[PDB]
Amino acid sequence: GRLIYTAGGYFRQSLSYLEAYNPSNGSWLRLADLQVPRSGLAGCVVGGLLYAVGGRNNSPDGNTDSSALDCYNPMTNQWSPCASMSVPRNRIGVGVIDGHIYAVGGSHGCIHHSSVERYEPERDEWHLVAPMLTRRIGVGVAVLNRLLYAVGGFDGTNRLNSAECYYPERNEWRMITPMNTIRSGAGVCVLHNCIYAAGGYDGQDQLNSVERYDVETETWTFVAPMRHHRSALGITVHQGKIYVLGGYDGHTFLDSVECYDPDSDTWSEVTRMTSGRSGVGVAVTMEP
């Protein structure tokens, strides 16, 4: 597309912001607020529509985990509710295959989900698929070659370095090589033939390290670390580069946006969000 959308997040409380960053000119635009504040959500795009999935409204007068799917049309600058998921999923991961949205893991109160469900926009309907082999919240999700990957997270007792892969035509999950780092609340995306995992929390510290999984060799390799340690970051890809947005560095809710160039193996600061926040949903689509 053309713009990087950041939706929701957390600073003091869950947020309703929708803001769009244009890498071509450095500008930010504030767009229509989410109908309900939410942090720990995920964003994705299907058919030029932006979707906000799951999360939690951490608010002065209560905390409510979200089963919501909400749809933002850039042409109209309007959010509309879509069909809700079977269960609330805070600290969710999502991935898109063949025009379908996969909602992965997340929490509902003390329940840590292994369940996974798939949304078909053409029918505005969710259906459960096979659950993961592991309960995962703060799970990173990516798609490569029409296979779905769930990476890291927290199973209710331990943060994880494990990862697994979903093969849709077999409706089956299989473990892949674990990462070399325990990561929960990392940013996970795909670039070229690799699954990247950036940042996260390992049980003791927020991380700046970044590693990538080559599906052909089944090995993880570290690349250059980010300039800022961060957990609960947003991540997306735009014209062959990775963008990481916000997060928590153990001291500050970051407004920093960093950009990774894989040809030079370097990170640089490219912009700042209008305010520091963590737990955003991020996706890329046309400008409004």
Ligand SMILES: O=C(O)c1cnn(-c2cccc(NS(=O)(=O)c3ccccc3)c2)c1C1CC1
């Ligand atoms: O600790 C873990 O293992 C774990 C599992 N999922 N997430 C996760 C993932 C996404 C969002 C949030 N929430 S947030 O409101 O953005 C928030 C983050 C940091 C501090 C205060 C609020 C949390 C985490 C933490 C991030 C590390």
